[PDB]
Amino acid sequence: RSGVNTLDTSSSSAPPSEASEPLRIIWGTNVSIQECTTNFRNFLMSFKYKTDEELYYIKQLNEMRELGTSNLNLDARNLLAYKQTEDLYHQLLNYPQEVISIMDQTIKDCMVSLIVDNNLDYDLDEIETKFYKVRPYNVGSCKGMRELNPNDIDKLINLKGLVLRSTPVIPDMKVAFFKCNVCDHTMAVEIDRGVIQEPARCERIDCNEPNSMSLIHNRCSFADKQVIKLQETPDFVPDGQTPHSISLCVYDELVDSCRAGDRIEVTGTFRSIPIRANSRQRVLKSLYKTYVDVVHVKKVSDKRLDVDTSTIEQELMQNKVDHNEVEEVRQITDQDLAKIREVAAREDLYSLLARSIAPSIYELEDVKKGILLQLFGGTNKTFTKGGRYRGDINILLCGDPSTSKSQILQYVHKITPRGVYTSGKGSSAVGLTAYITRDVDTKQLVLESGALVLSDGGVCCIDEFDKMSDSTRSVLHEVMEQQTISIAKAGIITTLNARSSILASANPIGSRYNPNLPVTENIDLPPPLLSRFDLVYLVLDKVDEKNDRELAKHLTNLYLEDKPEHDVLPVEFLTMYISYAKEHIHPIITEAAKTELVRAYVGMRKMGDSDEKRITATTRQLESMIRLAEAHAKMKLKNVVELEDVQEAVRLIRSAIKDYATDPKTGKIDMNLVQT
Amino acid sequence: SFDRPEIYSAPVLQGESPNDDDNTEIIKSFKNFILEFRLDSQFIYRDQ
Amino acid sequence: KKFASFSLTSDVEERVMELITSGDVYNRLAKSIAPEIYGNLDVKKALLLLLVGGVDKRVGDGMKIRGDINVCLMGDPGVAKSQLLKAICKISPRGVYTTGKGSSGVGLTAAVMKDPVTDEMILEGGALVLADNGICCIDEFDKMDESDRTAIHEVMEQQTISISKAGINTTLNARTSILAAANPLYGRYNPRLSPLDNINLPAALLSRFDILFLMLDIPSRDDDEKLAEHVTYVHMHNKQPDLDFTPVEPSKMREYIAYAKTKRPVMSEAVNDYVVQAYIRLRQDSKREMDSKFSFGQATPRTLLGIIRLSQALAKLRLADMVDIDDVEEALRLVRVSKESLYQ
Ligand SMILES: Nc1ncnc2c1ncn2[C@@H]1O[C@H](COP(=O)(O)OP(=O)(O)O)[C@@H](O)[C@H]1O
Ligand SMILES: Nc1ncnc2c1ncn2[C@@H]1O[C@H](COP(=O)(O)OP(=O)(O)O)[C@@H](O)[C@H]1O
Ligand SMILES: [Mg+2]
Ligand SMILES: [Mg+2]
Numbered sequence A: 001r002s003g004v005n006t007l008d009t010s011s012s013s014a015p016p017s018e019a020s021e022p023l024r025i026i027w028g029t030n031v032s033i034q035e036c037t038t039n040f041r042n043f044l045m046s047f048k049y050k051t052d053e054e055l056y057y058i059k060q061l062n063e064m065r066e067l068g069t070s071n072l073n074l075d076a077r078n079l080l081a082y083k084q085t086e087d088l089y090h091q092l093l094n095y096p097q098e099v100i101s102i103m104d105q106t107i108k109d110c111m112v113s114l115i116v117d118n119n120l121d122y123d124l125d126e127i128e129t130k131f132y133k134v135r136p137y138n139v140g141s142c143k144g145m146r147e148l149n150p151n152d153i154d155k156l157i158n159l160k161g162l163v164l165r166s167t168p169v170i171p172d173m174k175v176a177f178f179k180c181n182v183c184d185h186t187m188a189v190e191i192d193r194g195v196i197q198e199p200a201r202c203e204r205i206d207c208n209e210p211n212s213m214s215l216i217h218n219r220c221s222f223a224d225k226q227v228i229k230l231q232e233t234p235d236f237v238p239d240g241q242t243p244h245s246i247s248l249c250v251y252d253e254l255v256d257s258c259r260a261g262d263r264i265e266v267t268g269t270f271r272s273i274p275i276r277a278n279s280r281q282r283v284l285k286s287l288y289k290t291y292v293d294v295v296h297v298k299k300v301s302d303k304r305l306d307v308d309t310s311t312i313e314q315e316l317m318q319n320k321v322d323h324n325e326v327e328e329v330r331q332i333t334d335q336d337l338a339k340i341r342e343v344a345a346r347e348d349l350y351s352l353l354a355r356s357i358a359p360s361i362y363e364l365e366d367v368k369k370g371i372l373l374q375l376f377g378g379t380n381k382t383f384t385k386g387g388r389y390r391g392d393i394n395i396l397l398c399g400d401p402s403t404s405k406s407q408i409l410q411y412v413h414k415i416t417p418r419g420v421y422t423s424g425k426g427s428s429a430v431g432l433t434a435y436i437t438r439d440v441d442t443k444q445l446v447l448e449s450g451a452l453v454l455s456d457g458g459v460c461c462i463d464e465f466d467k468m469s470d471s472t473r474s475v476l477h478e479v480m481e482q483q484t485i486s487i488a489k490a491g492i493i494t495t496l497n498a499r500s501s502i503l504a505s506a507n508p509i510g511s512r513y514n515p516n517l518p519v520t521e522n523i524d525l526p527p528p529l530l531s532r533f534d535l536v537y538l539v540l541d542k543v544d545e546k547n548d549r550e551l552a553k554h555l556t557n558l559y560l561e562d563k564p565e566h567d568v569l570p571v572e573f574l575t576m577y578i579s580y581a582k583e584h585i586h587p588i589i590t591e592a593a594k595t596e597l598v599r600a601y602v603g604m605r606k607m608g609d610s611d612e613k614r615i616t617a618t619t620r621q622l623e624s625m626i627r628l629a630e631a632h633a634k635m636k637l638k639n640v641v642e643l644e645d646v647q648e649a650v651r652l653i654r655s656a657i658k659d660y661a662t663d664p665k666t667g668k669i670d671m672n673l674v675q676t
Numbered sequence B: 001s002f003d004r005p006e007i008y009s010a011p012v013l014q015g016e017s018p019n020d021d022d023n024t025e026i027i028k029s030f031k032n033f034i035l036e037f038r039l040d041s042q043f044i045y046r047d048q
Numbered sequence C: 001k002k003f004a005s006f007s008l009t010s011d012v013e014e015r016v017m018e019l020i021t022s023g024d025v026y027n028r029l030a031k032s033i034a035p036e037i038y039g040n041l042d043v044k045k046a047l048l049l050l051l052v053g054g055v056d057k058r059v060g061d062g063m064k065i066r067g068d069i070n071v072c073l074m075g076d077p078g079v080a081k082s083q084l085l086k087a088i089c090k091i092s093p094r095g096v097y098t099t100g101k102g103s104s105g106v107g108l109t110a111a112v113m114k115d116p117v118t119d120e121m122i123l124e125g126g127a128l129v130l131a132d133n134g135i136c137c138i139d140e141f142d143k144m145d146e147s148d149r150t151a152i153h154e155v156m157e158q159q160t161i162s163i164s165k166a167g168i169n170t171t172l173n174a175r176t177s178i179l180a181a182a183n184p185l186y187g188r189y190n191p192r193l194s195p196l197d198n199i200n201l202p203a204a205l206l207s208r209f210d211i212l213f214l215m216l217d218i219p220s221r222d223d224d225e226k227l228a229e230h231v232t233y234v235h236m237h238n239k240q241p242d243l244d245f246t247p248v249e250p251s252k253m254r255e256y257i258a259y260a261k262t263k264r265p266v267m268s269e270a271v272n273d274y275v276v277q278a279y280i281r282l283r284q285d286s287k288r289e290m291d292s293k294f295s296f297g298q299a300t301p302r303t304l305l306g307i308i309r310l311s312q313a314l315a316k317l318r319l320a321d322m323v324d325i326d327d328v329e330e331a332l333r334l335v336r337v338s339k340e341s342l343y344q
């Protein structure tokens, strides 16, 4: 009971076959158009999420019409709930090509029926003329690209990976434009399955000359196409299996929706195609080439923070212009916002969050607090008329080799949106910055990005920072001091952004950090270099029976049952809170904080005033106190930095290097003063 | 040291509506004329 | 046959049941690794436990802790270290072997090339990737280069290898165990010098090994006779000399190890209490020894983790769903024996 208008794809797929009691069963398939459309309409008009009682999709369609959106994101899992679609699920998985068009036509007819049956308004021509589309995004679990067989071609699958390269926009013809070179009569021809039927005769009765049709290139109509190179990360990896990179094809609105370094999850169709042996001939190779066609892309997850919007400002306006409906940041509900406010309202927020980070690592309160402040980050100034200052924070870890200073890096890497985990001796100056490589398909030379550029807007983890060669270490100066990298190589002269934080680890010379020598003789780094980091952490291991008992019990508890069961916030809520705080708040400093900052910096400069016994203070420490105070204020949803913030920043900076237990004359450490 | 590849076909679908000015329809009409035409209640052409 | 493809059945069932019925599985299997080498029983037990492995644990929140054991042998020249390395690499179903400078650079890790058959670039793995889910044997460990030492360092750390070089930025999976061999710095061990000055490798790298055996050659007119009789009998025949013991063939050894690898025992509260007490005592003790510059390293939580893994491996070998105090007793027994040569 509604109006209907057939689509061109539906008419093309019209040709039926017999042997199905409904008739109209497409040859080769088992799909039946009437039953599929009827089941889809019933499911659309009746489905609730079991707020779980209301009509789930009726509203979504209502807001779609109200706003003007043309894309419906369909969770393929939902169809398994309703009883009717228990088979439509498998039909969609096995025969996506026809099913997607069927659903699109059904959706358009549903929209028309919804608008008309309620007599809302008479302006229905726009919706009647416009297009619609449906994007599945929750296909069942896959086993990795390696494990598909030839029989899985033209099926629907999902992948996860890391973006590496994206070719520029390629024009793709859809309508060719011919002219008759004797009567100026012009014709248009529509592509059919990738073949254009050139006319053999002018169709005019007066003009009937044979082979008089020429092609005017600029007068045709073209589409958009792009190719993406993806580094997949399958969940299950067989024995001795190494990666490669896959080719994805994106069309129409999805072009330019991904940037190298992004972690994404794609849903697409598995394809195949033969490739010409050489341009001169028209012979083909028996062995086919595989790729993927993108139908949906998901750029958000609840296991990690959202991208820092400060780095993608223009991309958002471009997305709005392009009308592509991909979302960069997660959506927030009123209940969630109220819960965020309530959680911020309590008085143990700081310790609660510190304990929340990495629940499986014991104690290390100050370490966890520093990690939290790094994740929150400082405020980013932008000077009208040129000038940039960023709130990125750099941290280094020194201490005994056997502590838990490596598990920290893995957790931060897995929680951050963008980053790379690299070792010191397994790197190179070019490999960290950029290089030129020959594309195996186009047979041309193209630039490719390095770790530091790929980590823009995120966190870069460096292990064994002391084994790094001087040449390799040279580049980090500009990155840490201007967040940019300048390149002067054959074919490229430009400066690239490197808005990334640094988290580095290092080990002491020999076996153990000797408290009878200054830190400069225990760390194998030039004393000047250690002054660039905002915080320096001395992880010392002291033998104490109480702490040993506590740690041993904590570790042995983890093996009580085959699965983990360990007052800690859940990771989802933690990430939601951190993302909201980062995006919505922007603290500023006040005079009361300025006075304290100046006094503290002067005191730090004066204290300790024969040399290379301690890390001499510098302007870097003043800037570090500024950034840490701003980050603390930005936490707990405040917009003005204050004296408590500055005091906490100074307390933390002093505690990290544990100046309290240090002799200010010989630079040695007393083990009976340090507290576990 | 391989042999020659083959080619073959089979009918599945129905093409465009058959025109009359086409060889297959001409042949079908002629076959119908041979197998049906009657004179004096006799299938003269079939019998001969 | 790979362990992953294991499948219970009457044919395997009767063989395995006969083996357990015979009894004394632990020592019977331990004595069957390279039966032509005399003595060296505890090292053989440690190697068998390395073969069996521990229990992997997924702690949640994405964090991960290994379940594989690492073994280093360091000793005087001429004690059959290479023979044992060969024996283990052969017994393993995915064992790989390497020596010093023979394999370096892309010999480890992987290298970028172009496939002939298809027209796509690929990475060819080295010894580490080729030995994934297996044992990698490294002879002449101390003579390796800094880059290779760092690669082994990271692999023993977290079973992954990170590469960032021109044309490549990736991470490889290296779920492999390490069996290393090494010699003292000045050839023979020098008791008048400290253990850390007797070796070239860093103390942290030494510490990361779950088991670190020290093998010295102190002449003894009694045991030398037994060793000579054993070796000369082996040459005169082609068999070991003992008659009261029958070795078990590699096929049966692999069968039993594959069957055992399907278990996953669990910890209990009494054993947890015992382990915490033992760890506290051991950690308190080691400090004074390390002060006198007479220890390879201070005890650390990695030691406790190694004890736990060894107890789990012993339980798996016993083919039980729960651990017992005797398993922890044996683990501590082995860890204590590992350095008895320094107190002669
Ligand atoms: N505070 C702690 N909480 C939990 N586990 C710990 C702690 N300290 C040490 N460990 C254990 O000890 C090991 C630490 O080794 P690792 O972090 O790899 O060394 P490093 O980080 O110093 O290179 C881990 O396996 C971990 O289980
Ligand atoms: N306990 C032993 N029983 C039998 N043969 C031994 C024993 N110890 C050493 N050998 C012999 O001495 C040689 C030692 O050489 P090798 O295997 O390279 O060890 P290393 O590298 O320690 O010298 C071997 O050929 C082995 O046959
Ligand atoms: Mg570590
Ligand atoms: Mg040798």
Ligand SMILES: [Zn+2]
Residues within 6 Å of the ligand: A180, A181, A182, A183, A184, A185, A202, A203, A204, A207, A208, A209, A212
């Ligand atoms: Zn014309």
